[PDB]
Design a protein around this ligand. Structure first.
Ligand code: A1AEJ
Ligand code: A1AEJ
Ligand code: LYS
Ligand code: LYS
Lengths: 363, 364
């Protein structure tokens, strides 16, 4: 195929060390084959949880005991489980724009879900305070999709809000947090909390592969108590997959991989920005590009988003429109992911985009 | 002394890691990866990769006569996630009914979702249609190929009474849980209940987690059109089975490795069951009643003994014999009945195992 991907929901496969991953799986398998049908703790194998605990304490400042952690095949199963540990009449609140899939999950569960618009610092604490929800879903590292990084002041506002009344919860979806360009790392919301009002949720899908689904969540001890009272849950990650993750982490292959990828995506992001800036000269507006694996581009042009995307599809440019992320007019806005984008396709990538916005490039 | 490690297991909740072709599984995974690596980076179709679903569909039509299209099938990491999903596709206020004795874990899942769950006793033909029509549930959970745990194979005639019952009123459904259906022994090679479902009241539930790599959970669910339509209305589900685990399973099947393994295992289990039956019959000479064999990986033993089912169980730990009593499969009182599972039982251990059991039962 001659497709070029500006997709945010695909991941790199050319730079993921799949041979290392398989070697770790062989090493795990050799270490624990006798017990493979035995290590089935519903929360995840303890040592896997401890390995992830150590990792996210180092790289995110998350503080927690392995016993608080729950591993799962993907963020959806963990979220669904979460909605059953939280009070059943909890009013939820989601960033708009945001993760519509999760919006739909909460609606389908019959939950009330308020939509909290963004401002320059991320999820609006004014809309939060006005609408008085019980549970926040927020993406502080790199707002999904707008790309805004929640500054520390706004984190503190959200935590003060959770702290002012019993039984308010912040679900911190730290998706896309493994990378930070032209700015340093901000400690996680969970890390700043002087209390225990944050559920930390992380995923390995952006850093290993969507193909494999591994996610986890760190419960505040009281939601852990409700979880432990259930008595019937089964782990959804295969034991060998968990042990492979453990070996991949404790061998150092994981941290080696992230470091190399941090450099790769930084240079890719820079070059892709320069190329968008030369091709569009000033008629592109780029925002949300200080972290994560995508940013936003707004375009000064006359066609609809449904049209610009319909042309790009014809021109074999995989790209998505910002309208997809309304939970529910202006100039067209698109999501440029660059995780799957080959460096050698950057120049030809913007062209096709510079042509999907209308149909040409006369110069 | 009394070697502490010398445990013999009669437990049903197992699968012989020893006998699984682990190297063939990894070679299939490697072949899948060579063919499709540039595809792991994509998002699986939410139902599961089509070609995986198609391979499973071809398999279960051959091996069970299930009649379905890959389009109807939903892959998931274990039966529980699929059952949770199912409870959300079925009407909120649906009234469920499960076999008693049965699978406590699914009972707990349903009750924790706030569902009314009826418990339905067995007769000689399995789940009691008479109790079903008395207690008036909407959705049945049943194990027709080999009732868990009594081991009764529901005969065609009772299958038809269930199908008739479901067709009589709107919003009835039959969940066919076809666990441990990869094995039958010399009788009752009867196809899936779903193969008779002229009116689309059946949801077929199958699983590989007994057949494949220990610790791996791959299950699937075949949905009738109205529930499939309800599933497509959601628009937000993410496939829980790793794409590469799906592609390995597909290679395992289409390379023939999967069926080769089942033929071998089936043979192994038929002989092990035979040898274990001959031994129980020799040791107990009629003071034992075996029922619920001819399929699966466990059967039931009723014992000719003044001892308590709980006295036998506690003496059994005292002999390093891991065994389970029928009493543990009540959801929520006479001759003692035990579940003999021979999944993780060594042929070396058959003669010792029944002799230990004889002293669990009688004390001498
Ligand atoms: C804020 C947020 N929170 C969780 C997830 C999903 C998590 C997960 N964790 N484990 N499994 N799934 C997503 C992304 N969702 C998909 C597309 C969004 C959409 O356009 O709908 C992309 O999925 C991935 C693709 C490649 C790599 C990693 C994720 C997300 O934006
Ligand atoms: C009627 C029925 N339906 C599905 C499943 C499991 C499905 C699955 N697939 N993937 N993930 N979960 C089981 C599980 N039974 C286990 C629990 C025993 C208990 O405590 O009662 C024991 O293991 C087995 C023993 C004998 C046969 C099969 C399994 C079951 O009984
Ligand atoms: N434990 C044996 C009996 C030993 C003494 C009589 N043969 C049974 O049968
Ligand atoms: N005492 C066992 C051995 C019989 O009888």
């Amino acid at each position: 195929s001659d497709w070029i991907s500006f997709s945010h929901m695909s991941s790199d496969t050319d730079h993921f060390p799949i041979k290392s991953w398989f070697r770790c799986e062989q090493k795990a398998a050799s270490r624990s084959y006798r017990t493979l049908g035995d290590m089935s703790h519903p929360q995840g194998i303890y040592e896997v949880r401890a390995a992830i605990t150590r990792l996210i304490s180092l790289t995110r400042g998350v503080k927690c005991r392995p016993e608080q952690m729950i591993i799962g095949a993907g963020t959806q199963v963990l979220m669904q489980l979460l909605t059953e540990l939280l009070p059943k009449e909890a009013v939820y609140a989601m960033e708009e724009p945001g993760y519509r899939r999760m919006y739909q999950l909460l609606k389908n569960a019959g939950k009330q879900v308020k939509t909290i618009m963004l401002d320059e610092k991320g999820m609006s604490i004014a809309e939060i305070t006005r609408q008085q929800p019980d549970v926040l879903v927020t993406t502080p590292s790199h707002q999904f999709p707008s790309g805004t990084i929640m500054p520390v002041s706004r984190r503190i506002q959200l935590l003060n809000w959770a702290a002012e009344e019993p039984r308010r919860y912040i679900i911190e979806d730290d998706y896309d947090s493994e990378f930070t360009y032209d700015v340093d790392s901000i400690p996680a919301l969970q890390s700043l909390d002087r209390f225990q009002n944050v559920i930390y949720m992380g995923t390995f899908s952006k850093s290993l592969l969507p193909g494999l689904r591994i996610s986890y969540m760190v419960l505040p001890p009281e939601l852990l108590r409700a979880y432990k009272q259930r008595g019937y849950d089964l782990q959804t990650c295969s034991s060998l997959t968990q042990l492979t993750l453990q070996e991949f982490i404790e061998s150092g292959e994981y941290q080696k991989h992230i470091k190399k990828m941090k450099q790769h995506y930084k240079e890719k992001r820079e070059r892709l920005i320069t190329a968008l800036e030369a091709e569009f000269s000033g008629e592109v507006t780029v925002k949300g590009a200080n972290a994560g694996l995508h940013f936003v581009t707004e375009f000064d042009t006359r066609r609809t988003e449904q049209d610009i995307l319909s042309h790009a599809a014809g021109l074999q440019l995989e790209i998505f429109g910002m309208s997809r992320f309304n939970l529910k007019t202006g100039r067209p806005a698109l999501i440029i992911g660059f995780a799957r984008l080959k460096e050698e396709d950057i120049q030809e990538g913007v062209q096709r985009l510079f042509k999907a916005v209308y149909g040409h490039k006369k110069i």
